[PDB]
Design an enzyme around this catalytic site. Structure first.
Site, PDB file in Angstrom:
ATOM      1  N   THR A  80       0.832  -1.238   0.000  1.00 40.22           N
ATOM      2  CA  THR A  80       0.000   0.000   0.000  1.00 40.22           C
ATOM      3  C   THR A  80       0.853   1.270   0.000  1.00 40.22           C
ATOM      4  O   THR A  80       0.855   1.988  -1.036  1.00 40.22           O
ATOM      5  CB  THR A  80      -1.012   0.002   1.142  1.00 40.22           C
ATOM      6  OG1 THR A  80      -0.309  -0.112   2.382  1.00 40.22           O
ATOM      7  CG2 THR A  80      -2.007  -1.120   0.979  1.00 40.22           C
ATOM      8  N   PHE A 117      -9.194   4.889   1.983  1.00 36.86           N
ATOM      9  CA  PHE A 117      -8.953   4.084   3.209  1.00 36.86           C
ATOM     10  C   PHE A 117     -10.216   3.297   3.573  1.00 36.86           C
ATOM     11  O   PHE A 117     -10.354   2.765   4.710  1.00 36.86           O
ATOM     12  CB  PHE A 117      -8.454   4.991   4.338  1.00 36.86           C
ATOM     13  CG  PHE A 117      -7.059   5.522   4.100  1.00 36.86           C
ATOM     14  CD1 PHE A 117      -5.962   4.684   4.188  1.00 36.86           C
ATOM     15  CD2 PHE A 117      -6.847   6.848   3.752  1.00 36.86           C
ATOM     16  CE1 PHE A 117      -4.681   5.162   3.958  1.00 36.86           C
ATOM     17  CE2 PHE A 117      -5.562   7.325   3.519  1.00 36.86           C
ATOM     18  CZ  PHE A 117      -4.476   6.481   3.623  1.00 36.86           C
ATOM     19  N   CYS A 130      -9.463   1.570   6.996  1.00 30.55           N
ATOM     20  CA  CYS A 130      -8.057   1.223   7.247  1.00 30.55           C
ATOM     21  C   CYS A 130      -7.639   1.608   8.666  1.00 30.55           C
ATOM     22  O   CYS A 130      -7.618   2.816   8.975  1.00 30.55           O
ATOM     23  CB  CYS A 130      -7.152   1.937   6.268  1.00 30.55           C
ATOM     24  SG  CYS A 130      -5.436   1.404   6.455  1.00 30.55           S
TER      25      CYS A 130
HETATM   26  C1  HEM Z   1      -1.652   4.257   1.678  1.00 31.88           C
HETATM   27  C2  HEM Z   1      -1.714   3.171   2.387  1.00 31.88           C
HETATM   28  C3  HEM Z   1      -2.937   2.394   2.561  1.00 31.88           C
HETATM   29  C4  HEM Z   1      -4.123   2.356   1.906  1.00 31.88           C
HETATM   30  C5  HEM Z   1      -4.472   3.114   0.650  1.00 31.88           C
HETATM   31  C6  HEM Z   1      -4.955   1.419   2.650  1.00 31.88           C
HETATM   32  C7  HEM Z   1      -6.263   1.092   2.295  1.00 31.88           C
HETATM   33  C8  HEM Z   1      -7.138   0.283   2.983  1.00 31.88           C
HETATM   34  C9  HEM Z   1      -8.512   0.087   2.650  1.00 31.88           C
HETATM   35  C10 HEM Z   1      -9.193   0.635   1.429  1.00 31.88           C
HETATM   36  C11 HEM Z   1      -9.039  -0.700   3.592  1.00 31.88           C
HETATM   37  C12 HEM Z   1     -10.452  -1.196   3.596  1.00 31.88           C
HETATM   38  C13 HEM Z   1     -10.485  -2.580   2.953  1.00 31.88           C
HETATM   39  C14 HEM Z   1     -11.853  -3.216   2.812  1.00 31.88           C
HETATM   40  O1  HEM Z   1     -12.913  -2.605   3.102  1.00 31.88           O
HETATM   41  O2  HEM Z   1     -11.860  -4.408   2.385  1.00 31.88           O
HETATM   42  C15 HEM Z   1      -7.978  -0.991   4.530  1.00 31.88           C
HETATM   43  C16 HEM Z   1      -8.109  -1.816   5.625  1.00 31.88           C
HETATM   44  C17 HEM Z   1      -7.016  -2.141   6.406  1.00 31.88           C
HETATM   45  N1  HEM Z   1      -5.729  -1.658   6.309  1.00 31.88           N
HETATM   46 FE1  HEM Z   1      -5.045  -0.358   5.066  1.00 31.88          FE
HETATM   47  N2  HEM Z   1      -4.287   0.931   3.660  1.00 31.88           N
HETATM   48  C18 HEM Z   1      -3.087   1.471   3.717  1.00 31.88           C
HETATM   49  C19 HEM Z   1      -2.079   1.218   4.632  1.00 31.88           C
HETATM   50  C20 HEM Z   1      -2.091   0.318   5.667  1.00 31.88           C
HETATM   51  C21 HEM Z   1      -1.044   0.013   6.579  1.00 31.88           C
HETATM   52  C22 HEM Z   1       0.372   0.578   6.607  1.00 31.88           C
HETATM   53  C23 HEM Z   1      -1.551  -0.961   7.424  1.00 31.88           C
HETATM   54  C24 HEM Z   1      -0.937  -1.677   8.569  1.00 31.88           C
HETATM   55  C25 HEM Z   1       0.280  -1.513   9.004  1.00 31.88           C
HETATM   56  C26 HEM Z   1      -2.891  -1.233   7.040  1.00 31.88           C
HETATM   57  C27 HEM Z   1      -3.716  -2.141   7.641  1.00 31.88           C
HETATM   58  C28 HEM Z   1      -5.053  -2.304   7.290  1.00 31.88           C
HETATM   59  C29 HEM Z   1      -5.941  -3.219   8.031  1.00 31.88           C
HETATM   60  C30 HEM Z   1      -5.610  -4.140   9.173  1.00 31.88           C
HETATM   61  C31 HEM Z   1      -7.168  -3.102   7.501  1.00 31.88           C
HETATM   62  C32 HEM Z   1      -8.412  -3.809   7.983  1.00 31.88           C
HETATM   63  C33 HEM Z   1      -9.117  -2.897   9.037  1.00 31.88           C
HETATM   64  C34 HEM Z   1     -10.367  -3.520   9.657  1.00 31.88           C
HETATM   65  O3  HEM Z   1     -11.260  -4.022   8.913  1.00 31.88           O
HETATM   66  O4  HEM Z   1     -10.490  -3.595  10.910  1.00 31.88           O
HETATM   67  N3  HEM Z   1      -3.187  -0.433   5.975  1.00 31.88           N
HETATM   68  N4  HEM Z   1      -6.821  -0.377   4.124  1.00 31.88           N
HETATM   69  N1  LIG Z   2      -4.575  -1.813   3.709  1.00 32.17           N
HETATM   70  C1  LIG Z   2      -5.267  -3.141   3.589  1.00 32.17           C
HETATM   71  C2  LIG Z   2      -4.473  -4.219   4.286  1.00 32.17           C
HETATM   72  C3  LIG Z   2      -3.225  -4.606   3.531  1.00 32.17           C
HETATM   73  C4  LIG Z   2      -3.440  -4.949   2.077  1.00 32.17           C
HETATM   74  C5  LIG Z   2      -4.616  -4.245   1.434  1.00 32.17           C
HETATM   75  C6  LIG Z   2      -4.839  -4.457   0.067  1.00 32.17           C
HETATM   76  C7  LIG Z   2      -5.909  -3.844  -0.572  1.00 32.17           C
HETATM   77  C8  LIG Z   2      -6.770  -3.054   0.163  1.00 32.17           C
HETATM   78  C9  LIG Z   2      -6.535  -2.836   1.517  1.00 32.17           C
HETATM   79  C10 LIG Z   2      -5.453  -3.409   2.159  1.00 32.17           C
END
Ligand code: HEM
Ligand SMILES: N[C@@H]1CCCc2ccccc21
Ligand SMILES: O=C(CCCCC1CCCCC1)N[C@@H](Cc1ccccc1)C(=O)O
Ligand SMILES: N[C@H]1CCCc2ccccc21
EC number: 1.14.14.1
Length: 455
Positions: free
Chosen positions: A268, A393, A400
């Site tokens: 990401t 996010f 996220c």
């Molecule tokens: C620019 C960076 C990032 C973007 C664009 C991003 C984007 C997203 C998005 C769109 C989701 C929602 C996914 C869904 O609804 O299926 C998500 C969930 C998540 N992201 Fe990210 N993410 C980023 C960085 C990170 C980082 C650095 C971490 C951890 C170190 C992380 C951990 C997670 C986790 C654990 C979820 C699940 C949250 C939950 O449902 O409780 N993400 N992310």
């Molecule tokens: N940020 C979350 C968790 C890590 C990988 C991923 C990939 C697509 C969309 C959301 C994420």
């Protein structure tokens, strides 16, 4: 009034499935959205998805009383190694709310003050690498951004050095994780997954799962044995108790959370930085404004936490890059009950939706005539942006958890890059977007000229 939904071209018994027989399925779905508009139905043998592209429909889909997070088939295949970690868990699974309650304080803006020193450690390694290139040489942008973001989450996650800047070939954990992620996405395209042609793919998938579990389970076992209390996510997970259940995470769930955070660190923030640098070198007036902010704010050899918070224009550049090329390009929802979307499209309980974030971010009715332009100033005032127009996010309680962490790391690194170097688009790079779970520029290269400012 009730309306038939548009559907793209079909291939007999395979219905729409062969349209995603490509290495660039998100970009294929974007072209379908441009042709068919705000919503279309996608059928495959024994499944139907509806793809949403308009803020008009996505603002309804983001109503948590009507729609919950769905595991897309992609996330169901990722769950074979990410288990019931936060990203691959259903909202109704006990381990989702439990891990969410335990981990929220580890991911807060307050927590970023503790991670800042480890982020600077890796950011300084990136700057030193570029300072040490010869005149004749260039930077492989997504390669170096991925080295950095993987190493940052390794260090803040569990005090482990992947030492990505010491390597041409990834650490073995990373080879296995990338190959597992590739197998999960490739399985989407298999009309007959049980055909023995795929028996080698299945054996390799199990071996790669074993490699990831063995390093991560050993790291957890090693931390418990030592009793060391470092300020990393692993310490918070071994010590933390859910206020609701009063229970801690078990070691299996901790392993899935670590695998999840390592996938995020690889996939990401590295894409965001790579698209941000791409837009800056294509928009020299924007690069100049961002470089002027970096120079004015980053007055010390090492950036402080407080200085990163003052890089406002750099924050806006990151948001405008997330707007035009959201590195995480989709999320999936299911209808909690029978309901009607947009006064037009009846849905049954359980019906699956996919939000096409790159399309949402191009809605001309929201962003205006200058929608294709890279203009970070459009993020000056969050209150001037319509509700649910901007979802890089995700949405609601399933947004996220890493948002603060990613934006802190990306703002620190982009600020230091803009302080330390001038950049040249020496090849006049033509954007080519590689897809994994996420979007990245492929083959994006630049030359840097040092401004010769000491660290
Ligand atoms: C620019 C960076 C990032 C973007 C664009 C991003 C984007 C997203 C998005 C769109 C989701 C929602 C996914 C869904 O609804 O299926 C998500 C969930 C998540 N992201 Fe990210 N993410 C980023 C960085 C990170 C980082 C650095 C971490 C951890 C170190 C992380 C951990 C997670 C986790 C654990 C979820 C699940 C949250 C939950 O449902 O409780 N993400 N992310
Ligand atoms: N940020 C979350 C968790 C890590 C990988 C991923 C990939 C697509 C969309 C959301 C994420
Ligand atoms: O829309 C897609 C293909 C792009 C995924 C991109 C998505 C993957 C996760 C992280 C965010 C980006 N997949 C759907 C529908 C589907 C199902 C089976 C076969 C073909 C398509 C799904 O995985 O449910
Ligand atoms: N993931 C890192 C590990 C170090 C080697 C490498 C090379 C290219 C792209 C990424 C990477």
């Amino acid at each position: 009034t009730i309306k038939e939904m548009p559907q793209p071209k079909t291939f007999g018994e395979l219905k729409n499935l062969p349209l995603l027989n490509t290495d660039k399925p998100v970009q294929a779905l974007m072209k379908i959205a441009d042709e068919l508009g705000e919503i279309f139905k996608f059928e495959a043998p024994g499944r139907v998805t509806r793809y949403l592209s308009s803020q008009r429909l996505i603002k309804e889909a983001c109503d948590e009383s009507r729609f919950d997070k769905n595991l897309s088939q992609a996330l169901k295949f990722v769950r074979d190694f990410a288990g019931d970690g936060l990203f691959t868990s259903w909202t109704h699974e006990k381990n989702w709310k439990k891990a969410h309650n335990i981990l929220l304080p580890s991911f807060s803006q307050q927590a970023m003050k503790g991670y800042h020193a480890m982020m600077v450690d890796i950011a300084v390694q990136l700057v030193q690498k570029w300072e040490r290139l010869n005149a004749d040489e260039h930077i492989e942008v997504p390669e170096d951004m991925t080295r950095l973001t993987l190493d940052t989450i390794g260090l803040c996650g569990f005090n482990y050095r992947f030492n990505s800047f010491y390597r041409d070939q990834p650490h073995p954990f990373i080879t296995s994780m990338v190959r597992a992620l590739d197998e999960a996405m490739n399985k989407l395209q298999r009309a007959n997954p049980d055909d023995p042609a795929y028996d080698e793919n299945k054996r390799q998938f199990q071996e790669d799962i074993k490699v990831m579990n063995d390093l991560v389970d050993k790291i957890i076992a090693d931390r418990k044995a030592s009793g060391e209390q470092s300020d990393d996510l692993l310490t918070h997970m071994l010590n933390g108790k859910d206020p609701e259940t009063g229970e801690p995470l078990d070691d299996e769930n901790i392993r899935y959370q670590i695998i999840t955070f390592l996938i995020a660190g690889h996939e990401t923030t590295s894409g965001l930085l790579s698209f941000a640098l791409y837009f800056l070198v294509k928009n020299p007036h924007v690069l100049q404004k961002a470089a002027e902010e970096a120079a004015r704010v980053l007055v010390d050899p090492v950036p402080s936490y407080k200085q990163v918070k003052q890089l406002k224009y750099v924050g806006m550049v990151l948001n405008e890059a997330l707007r035009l090329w959201p590195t995480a390009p989709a999320f999936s929802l299911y209808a909690k009950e029978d309901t009607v979307l947009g006064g037009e499209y009846p849905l049954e309980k359980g019906d699956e939706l996919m939000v096409l974030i790159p399309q949402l971010h191009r809605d001309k009715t929201i962003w205006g005539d200058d929608v294709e332009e890279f203009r970070p100033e459009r993020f000056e005032n969050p209150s001037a942006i319509p509700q649910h127009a901007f979802k890089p996010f995700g949405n609601g309680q399933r947004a996220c958890i890493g948002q603060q962490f990613a934006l802190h790391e990306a703002t620190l690194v982009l600020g230091m890059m803009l302080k330390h170097f001038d950049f040249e688009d020496h090849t006049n790079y033509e954007l080519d977007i590689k897809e994994t779970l996420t979007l990245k520029p492929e083959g994006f290269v630049v030359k840097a000229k040092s401004k010769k400012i000491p660290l």
